[PDB]
């Protein structure tokens, strides 16, 4: 049991607050945040750039321990890293940039790493600086994740939207 808290239910498994995702992991300490990474684990902005921010840079020192070992991700795939302060592990998601061409079809599949983790606090992956329809990633998480997911929206206009269209 985590002490998640103030958000409405959307499905059976998934539910969705207006929150900044990093006060939401300092509050809960969740098993698992998820991240809406680039293939890089270059977290500049967004999600990414606030999450490693407030790890004042341990995330991204890691993350380029594990590119050197590894190498890039793969567009849809995922790695389990350390959540540092904020969880005890961040798991990486890669949704497609479609502002860059790639296949939005890829966000299913980014989505599909979510079920090998019971409980995950995210973000809506790709909705941001990558271009795609925030309802459309939101109704492929939906249609997608089968384990219990608590979904961050920062922004307040997108929420109100959100939470009115059918999935
Ligand atoms: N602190 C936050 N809390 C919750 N939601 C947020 C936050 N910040 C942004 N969002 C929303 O989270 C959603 C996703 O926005 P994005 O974080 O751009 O992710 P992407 O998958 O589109 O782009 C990945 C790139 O973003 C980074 O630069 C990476 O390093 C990658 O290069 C949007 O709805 C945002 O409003």
Redo the contacts with the bound molecule.
Sequence with gaps: VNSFSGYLKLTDNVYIKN????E?AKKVKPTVVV????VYL??????????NKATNNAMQVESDDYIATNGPLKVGGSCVLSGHNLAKHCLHV??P?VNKGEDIQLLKSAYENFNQHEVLLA??????????D?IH?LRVCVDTVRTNVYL????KN?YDKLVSSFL
């Design positions: 929150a900044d995702i990093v939401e991240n809406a990474a680039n270059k977290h500049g902005g967004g999600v990414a750039g606030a999450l890669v949704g940039n973000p809506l992956l790709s909705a941001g600086i990558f271009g795609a925030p990633s961050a929206v920062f922004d997108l």
